[PDB]
Structure 1
Amino acid sequence: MRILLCSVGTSWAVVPEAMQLLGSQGFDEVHVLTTASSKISPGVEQLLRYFEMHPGPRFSISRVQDFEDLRSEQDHMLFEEVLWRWLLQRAPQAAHRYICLAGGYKTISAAMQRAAALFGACEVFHVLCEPRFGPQGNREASTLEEVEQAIATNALRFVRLGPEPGWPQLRLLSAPSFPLESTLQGPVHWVRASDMRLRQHVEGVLERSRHILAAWEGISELPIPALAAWPPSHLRWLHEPLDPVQDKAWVQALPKVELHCHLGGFATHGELLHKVRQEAANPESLPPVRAIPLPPGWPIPEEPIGLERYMRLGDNNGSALLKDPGCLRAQCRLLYEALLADHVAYAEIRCSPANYASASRSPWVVLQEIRNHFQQAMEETPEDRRCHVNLLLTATREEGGDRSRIARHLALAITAAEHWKNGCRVVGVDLAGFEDRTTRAAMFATDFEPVHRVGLAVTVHAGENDDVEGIWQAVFKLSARRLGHALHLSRSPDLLRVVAERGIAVELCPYANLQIKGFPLDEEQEGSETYPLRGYLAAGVAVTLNTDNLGISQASLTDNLLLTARLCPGITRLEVLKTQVFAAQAAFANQAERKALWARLAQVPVPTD
């Protein structure tokens, strides 16, 4: 809890004097950093003597290797880097520090205070002992018996200066980020600094701190303000192309947003299918496993397979299995686990409760059970590990919008919108079948005004066919906020400009689009038939990268982000961060959900290169 450092330049007796700041409350964990000269050797020996004569708090002394006396600016920079590394390692928490300024022979105290200013503390103080000590009773206490005479019969006054909270940018730095090499050559720690990397980090943070004109246009336009704390080299690494094989660890560790994830396309083949098939409540009404051979090369097929073949790939799950309550529970828990393993911070799961509704299970029962499964899954999860799952309701069935089904669907959506305000809740409706004319006419003939009034947003499956007019009508007559796919916006620059200026999100799915429609892979220049992601980002379009069916596509979200280097050659890692930012901004999340998601996306993993 409490940590006391009080680095020793000389005069070992300062440290035992400094551990009586709190009194009969203790200093919990105690560490010491010192210059490893011959003079200190008696001092460190006597510090060990005092430590062994008074048990209690953890005791560690760290002498610096190849540093015998601070003698210049460079000998001070070396100790300053070692001080910062030992500080971050021995006191990991940003505000658990009781920094002691006493005991500096040459600028040690100044550097210690400056480190307190730069990294933070909760008490930067100085210790004074009365001069009623020594052989003649005229100096301070510099002996074990003198130290005890000081501790008892109170003679210690403590000048507290302040907590000094420290720089916000430098508080993100930790010991694992900057390893410090230590050798236990005895009971005393022996520390050396390998590279001057903390020093460069801190100085770079402090340069743009005082830079006025040079700082601007060098860190601006950056999608996340936390990236302005990033080193200039880590920012250059962001403006360079994504590596699909080297940046896999980075993308996997990236907090991500999922806005397009159908529930019924998750456990459609393999072990997940047989798990959702074994958690069944009724194991004898369960449909047989239909032989569905995956296309050769899956998830990357040699030729596009089309939409109907893609849909029939997910025929072992969906309405087949999820009408069983046990299968639906297994499906929801396993999909939440798959979202957890992929570092998905926020997710909007598209579900169609009527497709999973049985004779004894009305659509509202199915929807309520799905919501409760996801709510339990999130409630069993720590808040900085949690994925906030929201729910969307889908309007399926190409070729015919029978007015009875949309009315049941939208009414269910409206009832569920007002039933839950916290945790998992229904936040919108997804309008599938938009790629027809009868279902599309039924959608535009349906009144979505109650949906708009209750706070539900609208998404549409877009751009599978080059239908600009359908996009126009969904945007302005349906008040849709997001477009699914929409792979042919670039053909009409006017619709591009409208979508970009109105902030309408485009939900791109790399593997799904590649498998259903087909796109170039590993091309050298852009061309005409290339995936439209780069051209949408250049237009100013809020592009979001999602899956569609985790099972049918046989892919996670991180793999989908990895493919963008193969689908769009030259895509940078900053563009991936921008895509995550667009997905966060476009999510149908309320205030608390949005703040939580933006708090999770500020924790972008640092590049390990």
Structure 2
Amino acid sequence: FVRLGPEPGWPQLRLLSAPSFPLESTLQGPVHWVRASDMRLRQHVEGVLERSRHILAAWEGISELPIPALAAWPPSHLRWLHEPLDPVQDKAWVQALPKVELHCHLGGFATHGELLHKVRQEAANPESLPPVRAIPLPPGWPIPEEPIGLERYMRLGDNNGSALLKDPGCLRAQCRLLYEALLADHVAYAEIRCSPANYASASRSPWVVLQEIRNHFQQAMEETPEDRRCHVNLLLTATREEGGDRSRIARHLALAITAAEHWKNGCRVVGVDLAGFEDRTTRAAMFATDFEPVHRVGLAVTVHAGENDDVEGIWQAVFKLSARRLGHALHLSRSPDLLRVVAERGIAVELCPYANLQIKGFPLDEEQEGSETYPLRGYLAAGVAVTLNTDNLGISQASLTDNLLLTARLCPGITRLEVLKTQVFAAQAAFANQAERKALWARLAQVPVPTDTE
């Protein structure tokens, strides 16, 4: 007897059982006659060994993969990730990516086109519908020849928002249609920003509007299967301006505090969004005492500190408002000390490629990078947690898929791993709880398999 030694087997192969792969047997006398119905077991075994080789090959270097499930990818597929993103060839791969949406405005979704009419045709009171104003889009939209600035950008969404969403029927259509846009884009987690007091009426309090918005999204979420369901959380936008009426901020801040404990499950209010008029008169510290109640009840804060080309406003947002996320904020590099603080404290930067290109303008399709480029890759290289968003699905006329692909043209040489790293950043930056984060991470583990690699 020559013994070749015990064999431990393979960890996921020694658990297989006979019922899973039955062997049909015909009894001829005292001797069994066995046959195999198909080749399923070998296909299972070889698929396991195929995956086991991938994990061991990618085992050394797993810390550099934002999604650990990517270690089961073939080494050719992993080399594909490190290659620069192709805006025209990776349209299908980006479209199928489970995405995270952190900066999306409810009032800027169905601003023009067929979607504007679909919201209008479901008004509860068609006689109260405002006339459709003539708002012509700049030529080349969504990629204008020249940047249009912030004033012209907000005027492109004048057919929707407060004008249209005071109607309960229009508000319902806007919420359900926006969710349908999220599902079509394979968004797994979204945070929608709304201004419920802007849509309030004499008989409809801002609490009534917000409760309708939440239940419209909750009903949409419940009707969707768990596998492809987009979890929607709500941020309340506190809008600042030059005097006029700042009791609306107190109403929105109080509404978000009230809504925070009201809904502990499903769609829920998870933060406030300080936004509106950007100036040294309306800089962050002016509202520092308004947000003390927000901080006492554990509500997160994100700040629209991204147009006036200031860095002092970002300083108050980080340190006077305790903002967890910064909207836009394309001029962090102006203060290399503030850039270090943003990366060190984990403050996430919400980048909106199309909106930034349309409002500010950035060099496009340049083969080198310098002094004017979109700061996405510079922010990533500095350790900033960067997320990519749509800002306004309607005004910008682009989905989250289009915004991700535009970063290929905005930032030369951005890799497909870096796109995946922004989705991971957005999951970490989300104002989600443990149950929402766990559900979102299970979705992000399902990265689409690339086609036509090498």
- Cα 1:199–1:282 change in 2 (3 A) is same
- Cα 1:577–1:191 change in 2 (3 A) is farther
Separation in structure 2 between the aligned mates of residue 181 and residue 440 of structure 1, nearest angstrom: 77
Q: Deviations over 1:402-423 (max 9, x none)?
A: 5522222211111111110000
- Cα 1:161–1:554 change in 2 (3 A) is farther
- Cα 1:197–1:503 change in 2 (3 A) is farther
Q: Assess if the C-alpha contact under 8 Å between 1:180 and 1:191 holds in 2.
A: yes
- Cα 1:359–1:523 change in 2 (3 A) is same
TM-aligned CA deviation for residue 197 of structure 1: 16
Match of 1:588 among 431, 434, 438: 431
TM-aligned CA deviation for residue 194 of structure 1: 21
Separation in structure 2 between the aligned mates of residue 566 and residue 174 of structure 1, nearest angstrom: 52
TM-aligned CA deviation for residue 400 of structure 1: 3.2
Q: Assess if the C-alpha contact under 8 Å between 2:192 and 2:235 holds in 1.
A: yes
- Cα 1:388–1:216 change in 2 (3 A) is closer
Partner of 1:526: 369
Larger-Rg structure? 1
Kindly indicate whether residue 398 of structure 2 is the aligned counterpart of residue 564 of structure 1. no
Partner of 2:447: 604
Q: Assess if the C-alpha contact under 8 Å between 2:54 and 2:74 holds in 1.
A: no
Q: Deviations over 1:547-576 (max 9, x none)?
A: 111000111000000101000010100000
Separation in structure 1 between the aligned mates of residue 26 and residue 88 of structure 2, nearest angstrom: 36
- Cα 1:225–1:361 change in 2 (3 A) is same
Q: Assess if the C-alpha contact under 8 Å between 1:239 and 1:574 holds in 2.
A: yes
Match of 1:463 among 306, 329, 342: 306
Matches within 5 A, 1:59-458: 217-400=60-243, 402-433=245-276, 435-440=278-283, 443-458=286-301
- Cα 1:355–1:170 change in 2 (3 A) is farther
Q: Assess if the C-alpha contact under 8 Å between 1:169 and 1:229 holds in 2.
A: no
- Cα 1:176–1:373 change in 2 (3 A) is farther
Q: Assess if the C-alpha contact under 8 Å between 1:402 and 1:442 holds in 2.
A: no
Q: Assess if the C-alpha contact under 8 Å between 1:399 and 1:436 holds in 2.
A: no
- Cα 1:208–1:374 change in 2 (3 A) is closer
State the secondary structure of the residue aligned to 1:213: helix
CA RMSD of aligned residues (A): 6.0
TM-aligned CA deviation for residue 211 of structure 1: 11
State the secondary structure of the residue aligned to 1:574: helix
Matches within 5 A, 1:18-29: none
- Cα 1:173–1:390 change in 2 (3 A) is farther
- Cα 1:250–1:170 change in 2 (3 A) is farther
Q: Assess if the C-alpha contact under 8 Å between 1:434 and 1:461 holds in 2.
A: no
Separation in structure 2 between the aligned mates of residue 186 and residue 534 of structure 1, nearest angstrom: 74
TM-aligned CA deviation for residue 448 of structure 1: 1.8
- Cα 1:163–1:480 change in 2 (3 A) is farther
Q: Deviations over 1:136-188 (max 9, x none)?
A: xxxxxxxxxxxxxxxxxxxxxx9999999998999999999999999999999
TM-aligned CA deviation for residue 216 of structure 1: 5.5
Q: Assess if the C-alpha contact under 8 Å between 2:58 and 2:75 holds in 1.
A: no
Separation in structure 2 between the aligned mates of residue 172 and residue 244 of structure 1, nearest angstrom: 44
Separation in structure 2 between the aligned mates of residue 258 and residue 566 of structure 1, nearest angstrom: 21
Give 5+ residue unaligned stretches, structure 1: 1-157
Separation in structure 2 between the aligned mates of residue 464 and residue 549 of structure 1, nearest angstrom: 15
TM-aligned CA deviation for residue 440 of structure 1: 2.5
TM-aligned CA deviation for residue 399 of structure 1: 2.2
- Cα 1:202–1:435 change in 2 (3 A) is farther
Separation in structure 2 between the aligned mates of residue 422 and residue 266 of structure 1, nearest angstrom: 25
Equivalenced residues, count:
452
- Cα 1:192–1:399 change in 2 (3 A) is farther
Larger RCO of the pair (alpha carbons < 8 Å, separation 6+) = 2
TM-aligned CA deviation for residue 446 of structure 1: 2.6
Q: Deviations over 1:42-98 (max 9, x none)?
A: xxxxxxxxxxxxxxxxxxxxxxxxxxxxxxxxxxxxxxxxxxxxxxxxxxxxxxxxx
Separation in structure 1 between the aligned mates of residue 166 and residue 120 of structure 2, nearest angstrom: 12
- Cα 1:207–1:447 change in 2 (3 A) is same
- Cα 1:388–1:168 change in 2 (3 A) is farther
State the secondary structure of the residue aligned to 1:311: helix
Partner of 1:84: none
Separation in structure 2 between the aligned mates of residue 542 and residue 473 of structure 1, nearest angstrom: 19
Q: Assess if the C-alpha contact under 8 Å between 1:403 and 1:442 holds in 2.
A: no
TM-aligned CA deviation for residue 463 of structure 1: 2.7
After TM superposition, the structure 1 stretch with the greater mean CA deviation from structure 2, 161-170 or 557-566, is 161-170
Separation in structure 2 between the aligned mates of residue 218 and residue 439 of structure 1, nearest angstrom: 47
Q: Assess if the C-alpha contact under 8 Å between 1:340 and 1:386 holds in 2.
A: yes
- Cα 1:384–1:368 change in 2 (3 A) is same
- Cα 1:558–1:201 change in 2 (3 A) is farther
TM-aligned CA deviation for residue 506 of structure 1: 0.3
Q: Deviations over 1:264-321 (max 9, x none)?
A: 0000001100010000000001000000000000000000000010000000000110
Q: Assess if the C-alpha contact under 8 Å between 2:240 and 2:246 holds in 1.
A: no
Q: Assess if the C-alpha contact under 8 Å between 1:434 and 1:460 holds in 2.
A: no
Separation in structure 2 between the aligned mates of residue 187 and residue 552 of structure 1, nearest angstrom: 79
Q: Assess if the C-alpha contact under 8 Å between 1:357 and 1:363 holds in 2.
A: yes
Q: Deviations over 1:169-220 (max 9, x none)?
A: 9999999999999999999999999999999998898699699998664433
- Cα 1:183–1:389 change in 2 (3 A) is farther
- Cα 1:215–1:434 change in 2 (3 A) is same
Separation in structure 1 between the aligned mates of residue 148 and residue 190 of structure 2, nearest angstrom: 28
- Cα 1:545–1:188 change in 2 (3 A) is farther
Q: Deviations over 1:298-350 (max 9, x none)?
A: 00000000001000000000011000000000000000000010000000000
TM-aligned CA deviation for residue 453 of structure 1: 2.4
TM-aligned CA deviation for residue 455 of structure 1: 2.2
- Cα 1:212–1:558 change in 2 (3 A) is closer
Separation in structure 2 between the aligned mates of residue 162 and residue 573 of structure 1, nearest angstrom: 46
Q: Assess if the C-alpha contact under 8 Å between 2:239 and 2:249 holds in 1.
A: no
Q: Assess if the C-alpha contact under 8 Å between 2:236 and 2:252 holds in 1.
A: yes
After TM superposition, the structure 1 stretch with the greater mean CA deviation from structure 2, 391-400 or 237-246, is 391-400
Q: Assess if the C-alpha contact under 8 Å between 2:284 and 2:320 holds in 1.
A: no
| TM-score, normalised by the number of residues in structure 2 | 0.88
- Cα 1:221–1:315 change in 2 (3 A) is same
- Cα 1:330–1:179 change in 2 (3 A) is farther
Q: Assess if the C-alpha contact under 8 Å between 1:268 and 1:551 holds in 2.
A: yes
Match of 1:476 among 279, 299, 319: 319
After TM superposition, the structure 1 stretch with the greater mean CA deviation from structure 2, 391-400 or 290-299, is 391-400
- Cα 1:298–1:211 change in 2 (3 A) is closer
Q: Assess if the C-alpha contact under 8 Å between 2:242 and 2:277 holds in 1.
A: no
Separation in structure 1 between the aligned mates of residue 340 and residue 188 of structure 2, nearest angstrom: 30
Q: Assess if the C-alpha contact under 8 Å between 2:58 and 2:72 holds in 1.
A: no
Q: Deviations over 1:345-376 (max 9, x none)?
A: 00000000011111221111100100010000
- Cα 1:581–1:243 change in 2 (3 A) is same
Separation in structure 2 between the aligned mates of residue 386 and residue 584 of structure 1, nearest angstrom: 16
Q: Assess if the C-alpha contact under 8 Å between 2:240 and 2:274 holds in 1.
A: no
Q: Assess if the C-alpha contact under 8 Å between 2:189 and 2:230 holds in 1.
A: yes
- Cα 1:447–1:321 change in 2 (3 A) is closer
| TM-score, normalised by the number of residues in structure 1 | 0.66
Q: Assess if the C-alpha contact under 8 Å between 1:257 and 1:344 holds in 2.
A: yes
State the secondary structure of the residue aligned to 1:346: strand
